[PDB]
Amino acid sequence: TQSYTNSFTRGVYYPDKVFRSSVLHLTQDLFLPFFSNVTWFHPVLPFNDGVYFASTEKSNIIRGWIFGTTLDSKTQSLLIVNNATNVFIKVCEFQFCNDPFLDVESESGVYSSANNCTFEYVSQPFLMKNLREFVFKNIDGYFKIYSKHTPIIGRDFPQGFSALEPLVDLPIGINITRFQTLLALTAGAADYYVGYLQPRTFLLKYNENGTITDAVDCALDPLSETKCTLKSFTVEKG
Amino acid sequence: VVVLSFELLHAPATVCGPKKSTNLVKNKCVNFNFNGLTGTGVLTKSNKKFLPFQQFGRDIVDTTDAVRDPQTLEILDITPCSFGGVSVITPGTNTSNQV
Amino acid sequence: IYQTSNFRVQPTESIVRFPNVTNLCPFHEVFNATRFASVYAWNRTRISNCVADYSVLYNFAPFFAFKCYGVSPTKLNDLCFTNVYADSFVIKGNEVSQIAPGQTGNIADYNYKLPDDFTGCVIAWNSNKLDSKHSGNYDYWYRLFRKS
Ligand SMILES: *[C@@H]1O[C@H](CO)[C@@H](O)[C@H](O)[C@H]1NC(C)=O
Numbered sequence: 001t002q003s004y005t006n007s008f009t010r011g012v013y014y015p016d017k018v019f020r021s022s023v024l025h026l027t028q029d030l031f032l033p034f035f036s037n038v039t040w041f042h043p044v045l046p047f048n049d050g051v052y053f054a055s056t057e058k059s060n061i062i063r064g065w066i067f068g069t070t071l072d073s074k075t076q077s078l079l080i081v082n083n084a085t086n087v088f089i090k091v092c093e094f095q096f097c098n099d100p101f102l103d104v105e106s107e108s109g110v111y112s113s114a115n116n117c118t119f120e121y122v123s124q125p126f127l128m129k130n131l132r133e134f135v136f137k138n139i140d141g142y143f144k145i146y147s148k149h150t151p152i153i154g155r156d157f158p159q160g161f162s163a164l165e166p167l168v169d170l171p172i173g174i175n176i177t178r179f180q181t182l183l184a185l186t187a188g189a190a191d192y193y194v195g196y197l198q199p200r201t202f203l204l205k206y207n208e209n210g211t212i213t214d215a216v217d218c219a220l221d222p223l224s225e226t227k228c229t230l231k232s233f234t235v236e237k238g
Numbered sequence: 239v240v241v242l243s244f245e246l247l248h249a250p251a252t253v254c255g256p257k258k259s260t261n262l263v264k265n266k267c268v269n270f271n272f273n274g275l276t277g278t279g280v281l282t283k284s285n286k287k288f289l290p291f292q293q294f295g296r297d298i299v300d301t302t303d304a305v306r307d308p309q310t311l312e313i314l315d316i317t318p319c320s321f322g323g324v325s326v327i328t329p330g331t332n333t334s335n336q337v
Numbered sequence: 338i339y340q341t342s343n344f345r346v347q348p349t350e351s352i353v354r355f356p357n358v359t360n361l362c363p364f365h366e367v368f369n370a371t372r373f374a375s376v377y378a379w380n381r382t383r384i385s386n387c388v389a390d391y392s393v394l395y396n397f398a399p400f401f402a403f404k405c406y407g408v409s410p411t412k413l414n415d416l417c418f419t420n421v422y423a424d425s426f427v428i429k430g431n432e433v434s435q436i437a438p439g440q441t442g443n444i445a446d447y448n449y450k451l452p453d454d455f456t457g458c459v460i461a462w463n464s465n466k467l468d469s470k471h472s473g474n475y476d477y478w479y480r481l482f483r484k485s
């Protein structure tokens with residue numbers, strides 16, 4: 001609860017659909033800096049330019065997220081719940097209840113009522129220990145839900161490198177200055193993390209098949225910036 | 239009596255003109271337009287391994303050289319049409335007029 | 338030996354490709370559905386997030402006074418939009434003539450007044466026996482003289 005842990009090298013996502021083979025591409029984008037500083041959980045979390053979420057809960061409690069300006073039946077809000085059948089996305093107002101917990105069935109427990117609604121999207125359920133990562137970018141009006149599922153066993157925050165794939169860029173564009181997590185029902189096993197993205201420059205390595213297998217930050221230390229200047233992963237004496 | 243009262247709210251929805259796709263041709267210097275990507279070249283069969291979410295192929299100098307067909311998910315390698323210089327070999331015009 | 342000019346192979350034809358169109362609008366059944374309301378409570382469903390297929394509109398059942406108040410019908414095939422409202426109602430042909438943006442006359446200002454801007458186009462054709470009672474359809478009502 002409100003702990004702290006270094007982020008190591010995690011939170012790298014594909015910036016575009018372009019296919020590249022055995023190159024080294026230097027890109028400027030919103031990223032999570034290497035060895036950053038995240039807050040372990042075990043919530044009034046604000047939204048600034050995008051967040052990183054990497055819960056490893058065995059259950060599906062923390063599922064659901066609310067985005068908007070006032071997060072009330074005054075400005076349009078969102079809702080993304082991914083249960084065993086289908087994931088539902090609404091873009092309309094919902095008067096918030098006392099707590100953001102599911103009554104269990106999906107209306108009164110978390111909010112008051114649904115009124116003056118608009119575009120609603122559905123798709124296959126997102127779910128498929130089960131390390132699930134998200135990147136909630138909202139550049140322009142095409143809300144991005146970059147994600148990657150790694151059910152590989154690990155620690156509370158293990159090491160390694162793995163990239164994140166896109167999901168959809170829905171036509172939104174309402175004001176999202178504040179966001180909030182949801183949960184289904186405090187002192188619980190709410191093992192989830194938050195990491196704020198930031199403008200940064202990276203040097204990505206593509207294998208011949210076309211997957212990002214490595215990366216180096218360009219502002220972490222002198223060696224890193226030297227690598228970025230030479231556009232290589234090895235440096236000779238000089 | 240029925241109306242079709244339209245309204246465009248910033249970003250247009252998927253309601254748009256039907257996409258008048260045509261046939262596909264290969265091994266011929268042709269113009270092309272793959273989902274808004276223009277250019278001219280020769281379209282052949284490719285050995286690329288596109289992941290299920292890319293659309294284009296980019297080389298070192300960032301010139302497109304592989305495109306996936308939107309109708310059927312197939313990757314096509316492209317190549318510019320032939321070009322080059324022309325040189326004329328002649329003896330003196332005092333000698334003859336053959337080249 | 339002199340270098341004079343350059344040679345270039347000319348393109349032979351043209352080509353253009355796009356994905357499967359699909360995404361049909363579930364609103365064609367609004368057209369030719371004798372119970373598409375009568376005058377007042379038109380089907381609030383609107384044509385949105387599918388296709389702007391206006392080609393079938395002109396090749397539909399023969400209209401009598403199909404009037405487009407927007408852009409020319411020829412270009413309506415490919416212009417993109419976001420949402421398209423559809424009002425389902427039945428009136429008289431003289432009322433169809435009376436229907437215009439910011440116009441008076443019976444239903445045009447008493448039952449369902451057309452929008453002042455009216456970014457849209459009405460499509461009207463004769464119904465007759467489709468929704469007429471043998472003794473006179475008294476179930477259908479119209480405002481003879483509304484307050485304003
Ligand atoms: C993270 O932030 C906390 C408080 O802001 C600070 O004590 C700590 O040194 C920072 N770095 C790490 C690696 O936790």
Ligand SMILES: *[C@@H]1O[C@H](CO)[C@@H](O)[C@H](O)[C@H]1NC(C)=O
Nearest residue numbers: 068069070174175176177178
């Ligand atoms: C969005 O909401 C914030 C407060 O939540 C406000 O300060 C801001 O002016 C609003 N508009 C934009 C464009 O950020």
Ligand SMILES: *[C@@H]1O[C@H](CO)[C@@H](O)[C@H](O)[C@H]1NC(C)=O
Nearest residue numbers: 081082083084085086088106
């Ligand atoms: C998943 O949530 C939807 C949203 O209401 C609900 O209709 C559906 O029944 C839920 N799935 C199950 C298995 O209850």
Ligand SMILES: *[C@@H]1O[C@H](CO)[C@@H](O)[C@H](O)[C@H]1NC(C)=O
Nearest residue numbers: 073074075093114115116117
């Ligand atoms: C939704 O639209 C109705 C009808 O225009 C309007 O009265 C209402 O204030 C809007 N907002 C809500 C939250 O109902």
Ligand SMILES: *[C@@H]1O[C@H](CO)[C@@H](O)[C@H](O)[C@H]1NC(C)=O
Nearest residue numbers: 207208209210211212213287
């Ligand atoms: C890409 O394809 C090659 C050829 O089959 C294979 O050797 C390589 O492991 C693949 N890389 C992946 C799937 O990341």
Ligand SMILES: *[C@@H]1O[C@H](CO)[C@@H](O)[C@H](O)[C@H]1NC(C)=O
Nearest residue numbers: 308309310311356357358359
């Ligand atoms: C597009 O239509 C053709 C026509 O039969 C079909 O073969 C093809 O599978 C369709 N594309 C997709 C992605 O379903």
